[PDB]
From a paper:
During glycolysis, pyruvate kinase (PK) catalyzes the irreversible phosphorylation of ADP at the expense of phosphoenolpyruvate (PEP), yielding pyruvate and ATP. Previous characterization of cytoplasmic T. gondii pyruvate kinase (TgPK1), using either parasite extracts or a recombinant purified enzyme, indicated that this enzyme was allosterically activated by glucose 6-phosphate (G6P), which enhanced its activity under PEP unsaturated conditions. We solved the structure of two different constructs of TgPK1: the full-length enzyme (Met1 to Glu531 plus its N-terminal 6×His tag), which crystallized in the absence of substrates, effectors or added ions (“full TgPK1”); and an N-terminal truncated version starting at position Ile39 (“truncated TgPK1”). In both crystals, the asymmetric unit is composed of a tetramer with imperfect D2 symmetry.
The full length crystal lacked electron density for the initial 40 residues, the same ones absent in the truncated form. The monomers from the full length TgPK1 structure were all similar to each other, superposing over all atoms with rmsd values under 1 Å. A notable difference among the four monomers was the complete absence of electron density for the B domain in one of the chains (D), which has not been reported for any PK structure. Within the crystal lattice this domain was exposed to a solvent channel and the closest crystallographic neighbor is a C domain from chain C. The missing domain had little to no influence over the quality of the A domain within chain D, whose b-factors were similar to the average of the structure. First, the full length structure showed three monomers in an open inactive conformation and one subunit where there was no electron density for the B domain (disorder likely due to lack of crystal contacts). This is consistent with the B domain existing in solution as a continuum of open conformations. Additional disordered regions included several loops in the full length C domain (Val407-Pro409, Pro480-Thr485 and Lys515-Ser522). In the full length structure the differences between the A–A′ dimer interfaces are smaller when compared to the truncated TgPK1 but in both cases the smaller buried surface is associated with the outlier B domain conformation.
Author numbering:
A (entry chain D): 19 to 27, 29 to 106, 158 to 160, 193 to 195, 202 to 386, 390 to 460, 466 to 476, 480 to 492, ...
B (entry chain B): 21 to 388, 390 to 462, 464 to 494, 501 to 511
C (entry chain C): 23 to 387, 391 to 460, 463 to 479, 481 to 494, 503 to 511
D (entry chain A): 21 to 92, 94 to 385, 389 to 461, 467 to 482, 484 to 493, 503 to 511
Amino acid sequence: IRMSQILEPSEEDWTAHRTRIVCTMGPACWNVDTLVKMIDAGMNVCRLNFSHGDHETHARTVQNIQEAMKQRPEARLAILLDTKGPEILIMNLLPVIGEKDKHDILNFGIPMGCNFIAASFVQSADDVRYIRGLLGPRGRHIRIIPKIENVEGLVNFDEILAEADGIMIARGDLGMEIPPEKVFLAQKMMIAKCNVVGKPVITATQMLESMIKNPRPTRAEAADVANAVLDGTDCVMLSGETANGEFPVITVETMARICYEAETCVDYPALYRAMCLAPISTQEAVARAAVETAECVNAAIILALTETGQTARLIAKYRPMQPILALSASESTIKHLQVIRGVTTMQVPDHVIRNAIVVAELVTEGESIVAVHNLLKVLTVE
Amino acid sequence: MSQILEPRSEEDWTAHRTRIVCTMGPACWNVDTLVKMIDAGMNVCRLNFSHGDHETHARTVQNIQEAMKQRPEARLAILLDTKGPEIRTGFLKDHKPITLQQGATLKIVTDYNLIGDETTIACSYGALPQSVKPGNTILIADGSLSVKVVEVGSDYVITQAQNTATIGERKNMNLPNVKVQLPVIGEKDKHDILNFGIPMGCNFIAASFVQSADDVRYIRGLLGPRGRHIRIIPKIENVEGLVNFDEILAEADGIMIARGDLGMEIPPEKVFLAQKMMIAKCNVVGKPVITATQMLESMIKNPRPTRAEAADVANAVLDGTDCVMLSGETANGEFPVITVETMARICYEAETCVDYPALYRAMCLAVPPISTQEAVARAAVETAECVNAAIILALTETGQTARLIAKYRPMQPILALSASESTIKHLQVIRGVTTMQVPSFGTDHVIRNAIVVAKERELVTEGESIVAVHGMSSNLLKVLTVE
Amino acid sequence: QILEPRSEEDWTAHRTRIVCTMGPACWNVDTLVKMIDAGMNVCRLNFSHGDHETHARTVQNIQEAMKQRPEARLAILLDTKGPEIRTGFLKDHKPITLQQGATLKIVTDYNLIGDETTIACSYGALPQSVKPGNTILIADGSLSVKVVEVGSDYVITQAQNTATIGERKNMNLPNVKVQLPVIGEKDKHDILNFGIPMGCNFIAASFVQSADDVRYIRGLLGPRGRHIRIIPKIENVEGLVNFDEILAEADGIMIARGDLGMEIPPEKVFLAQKMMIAKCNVVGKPVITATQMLESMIKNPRPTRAEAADVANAVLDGTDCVMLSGETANGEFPVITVETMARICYEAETCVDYPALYRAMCLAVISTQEAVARAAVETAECVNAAIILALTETGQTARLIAKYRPMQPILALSASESTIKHLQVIRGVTTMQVPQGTDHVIRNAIVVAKERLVTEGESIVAVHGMNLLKVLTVE
Amino acid sequence: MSQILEPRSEEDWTAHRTRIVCTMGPACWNVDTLVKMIDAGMNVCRLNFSHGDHETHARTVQNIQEAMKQRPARLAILLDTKGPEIRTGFLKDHKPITLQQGATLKIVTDYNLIGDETTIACSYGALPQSVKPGNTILIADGSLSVKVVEVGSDYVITQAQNTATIGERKNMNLPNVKVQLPVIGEKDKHDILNFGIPMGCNFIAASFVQSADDVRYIRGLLGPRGRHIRIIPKIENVEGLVNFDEILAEADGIMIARGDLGMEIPPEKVFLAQKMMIAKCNVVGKPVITATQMLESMIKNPRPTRAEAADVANAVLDGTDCVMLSGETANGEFPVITVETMARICYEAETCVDYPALYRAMCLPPISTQEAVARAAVETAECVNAAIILALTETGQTARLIAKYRPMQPILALSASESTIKHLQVIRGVTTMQVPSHVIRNAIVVAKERELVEGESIVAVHGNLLKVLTVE
């Protein structure tokens, strides 16, 4: 590799980054016109911060998200409810889900169509079980993403992960609970444990903070974000940068550019062999086979036909160089998938495989395609 | 050191992956003999057209068919082995054998009317003096007499004998390092191909003494649209066939290695190299290879082979042969059935040494830009090991899919499903493959009924894993659980 | 397991080398001694400031610190001033405020006292270098302006953001080559009249833009500066674009991240650092990661999370050295900062897969010397070797082994004073001065490791180039 | 195919790695042809103590010593014991008998009985206490097979499975039955102690080894005076196979007698036994000799058969250290020509050898220091593309450890020890050079003369040290 290749400046290319982007809602990005513009910049998930505001405030946000998707029919934004929880003022030293949090989950989260609950200050697996039970019949389409923000939740992380659907890592908050020289270790460990098990991880806090005021990040900030991507993060999350910042749109597209530059350094063939080293099921074996065949026939796209999302997730876990287009009839599965690195989505009603390749300018005529369902198909665009 | 020594049960040795070709003859003309040979492991019936006529061979075919009616699950392929070019000495005075002294002159003439003596004999090959030059060696009577060419004219050659030997009338002759100018497919061989091979349902033509790709292209042209369901298997028997092997193989559908004949054309210590080289090259492109001649010769008269015979057969299997061939052992021997059992038993012993993971890895490195069909075949073999499948199903019309899987030599049996009767027959020559004919077909119900038939045949138990593959331009890999 | 604090015995044994910048905060001998204890390996003299008299006094303080710590063999690195671009003086020395969208004239007449509308520039070739659309950064990038017009002695620019700037502030010219001598008369004077006589072991050359620059310093050093090694600093696009030709001529590389961030888009600098570290790794040339390391520690006794991660990731990229600048030169906590970096380095070395580092190096790169160095690393892993002995005159044997990043400590044995100092820049190498045959040298070295690194009856791999590999047991 | 079909020069096939053992006898006794066999490829001289007397064998040892004076080549001398033998008795009027298939044949313990077609004697007195109904007895090289139907106190009743004609005092095999006779009897004891030790034999090849006790018995028998002699158990029967692992553990090397194994086990299983045994010797670095049924047709013919050459080739490909000639050199018309042919076959088979695969297979037991250095030396030699490997050794261990990894480059072993030098004539890939007792520079000064190695790289090893030099 020559250096000149690194220094090359393209709208169509960085738009096709693999890492997913979570943006926090707030006064600065609420508007339909801004949300529509953020979708174009690469927004995948909208976070509702229930630390502030009430049900009336967040309802109008959700309606604005809904109207933003009306202008972008090809987009499917997931909505994530981030709890207040039991929240050295530089404040650190109560139930994880109290009456207020429970009211938010039951009487907003469920009826308003939120796809994820990001639960603040989770300390044990019992917390996740409590939330799971809280959701119950009516909330079965909602996924749980605990936030590891303290020593307790770090200590019980394995059992938290086993119960959870995904994880959010709050680095800034962790750095106030453990020594700063060790947070990078904790972050690496947690992402890797999430990766080996195919569960989405979101890297949160202290991302591009200076962009709240500035239209450009620092060298330090960009590099910090890049290493989260190289650690193996599925998602990167903006907080104040989008909620209260002066450049919400420019921040998202900047984030997309950081992600694209970081995914450049990613060794895809070695990432496959590493996941193979760390017996296995039929569906696991077929997903591996699919990823192998895809590089082998130099596939343009991998089609993951899925109802529950498991097939897409299983393939994404092996981090293929090829884009994964997930095809599903389930509306919530499509929403849950917005948090999975390397996956994009298409809603569908065997004709699906043929009719998808028509919609997909993702392919050229005569290019190879690897479709998967306990089966693996290899096709050529006709 | 004692697991090597334990006696092997019929249940075990009948499950060997290597395929057995048996030559038809008076020793196995009988329908009851043929049925027992099926049970012993016979997969292909060779009809040697060096002897017999269209009537006698047609009768043999009826006997094979009658045998197959007693074994309806067996699908014997029929292979026509051509006579091809033959070179023979002439007659001798009073029909009495002659002794040649070492260092003595022997004139060989092209007048085949010439009744010979110890100083002059005839050759059936009229272009002998235009083929052989001074310094060339001529082998007579299975190389028992060796003579060196000293002088050539238009209708004769003068030779010096290199050893002391006694020869009879009409004995065979070899021309080491000289191309034979006789047609590889003469009017008689053409007649055999067109007027027997096609209408009698022969599946393969094994062409004796192929010396160039032109020879194969000629046979293909000869067969034509009417002979399109027939595969061409050149026999490699001399230097010309060795030198032109890559071109021959590119045109061929499979290869037969005739070791004993090669031994009459090149030095003995080079034949083992040519066999390995040729097997490996066939393996690399997934084209079937048959190792033939000098296999279990001692079993023509003995119920047991020698140590060396069995070691020879074993090493052909370890070299990567698809097929092993019996000739006079089945055709004219006292123990045709026991010889097929012994062959099957040796194959099974040799396949014990086979490291399947290492063979798959060797092949992946061997094949360079690979096709969709091959990549799915690779994946199917790899997936089968990974899920510990009992069986691999190859659904195939042309046989390509099954041939591609077999090429990577999986530890599990390949059950090939086809609607094409000729493809079922062509696959009898492919190592590791068993066959099951199905009606024309939608893939899901075909796999479903295949598991039902495979369950009763004791190939799969309920709960076991199965890999199924269907190829051609959509390709498919499917993993299922036996119900 | 990650919540468990490290003891000093653990973290002091980190393998990454530490360069510390000299300055008033670590001027006194006692502070330098504590910094050695904390893990300082190389002393950077920053020749952007001071003179031959003041820097000589610093060297004498370094030497005095070394008398108290006889085991330390600190290398001294001279960092050239190099080319600088600077804004001019302002009316009444008052700082000026530029409003976004407003035009600013930049003139090449450095005698001009500027205002809100017009400022001077020290770089006379500015109109020759810059074209419409080029960005000019002023005062650590706090002000960005875009070129709109070029003239003979002027450039007309549009303010990209609102900012207040003072007098004589730094300027950057992203994507433009600076047509100033990388080694000017002042730099040459420093190299020849301080670098050589004063016992400097490295020249870190600021703002290297071509291999031409390196060939020049080498030619300048000549026979007399033969014991001195050249470490180009890559700080702009030109150094980047020509990186490979620079590396080929160079003895090592210093990466100036903070300065590169003033020259290229920020998202591309982490990429440049990775690519360059890898390239130095493949040819076994030492690389120093520099600037914006533990900056907040100039004022604070602890680093930020982001700072810790940045240093850790440089180690994980494969850096030989990490460098402190202001943190040791002008900071409130020079000693504590060195300890902290040594600790981060030890924590990051925890995440290193050494068998993978050996295997990847074997696929990336064979000379007799390199083969034996390769065989030595593998053999060391094959037996349960405690340390690797590298007998070397030039330091090459030691470097060739270090390149393969063995899990074992490398003890480098040398009679050469300057080789011992050169190796202070090599990751995973510790050094030992020796006068002696190839067998007598291995003997006394085994006894000195016992009085430190080897228990009774452990395997030891010894390597000697001249090319032998020896496997011994401690007895 | 062109590369395969090119005639190999004498310069090339002389440089083969596999070692050749030649059996001594009337056809090769004399110094003249013995010298000519040396530079055909003979590495080891086998003395067959089934025949001849001490004076007869002493004249041979003398002829070897004289031949080595004319080629100063260092031939190992191997003493091959007679061991236990089972034999049929004498016959009526000294005339052969033929037995018809299905016919009854009684076999008796009384060796004084002059036999009929109905009854013969056997020299093995424990026959009726060894063999049981259902066992097979093989007579005269497996010419005749009989099955045991009945056993008495001093007789066995059998049924001929085969029509065959047998003469007097023919050999007998008891497939799957242990021969309850001393493997080393008083006569074998006399041969080893009063010929082997005094006449300068380097190896004892022990016929018909059935137990590891047999090996330990010979070792104690040699004691201090025979400590420079190495023991090669021959594996010839089921007991030898069943006890192979512990036999090999006590052995210095192994001789596989295929032809005799084919008389003791089913023929289709011998190739497995040979493959297993060769591999097990390779794993442990102990030399293995492939003996019997090599180039038998060359007793009468100047050329081998297609099948014979291929059998030899696959022994080399299995990983045999040595191939052995028996009657081809002991008797037979073309002893010299047979050695050349053997060397040429070995050279062709060694063309198929995948050397990078062999090193990685041997690498695929927490290894020792000297083993690690030997691996490193093979790894380095390939990396550096060395001309030769120099192995400095007194016990031979360093040379044997290197050869085990089967390097592409020839191993020149250098030793002060006369016995070590001769012990190494049995190690594939090794050639030897005696050193007076630094030594590397003088070895390179002689290697350059022998056209083996200016500018080339050389890997030298001492066992723990490795060196890479470049010749001037």
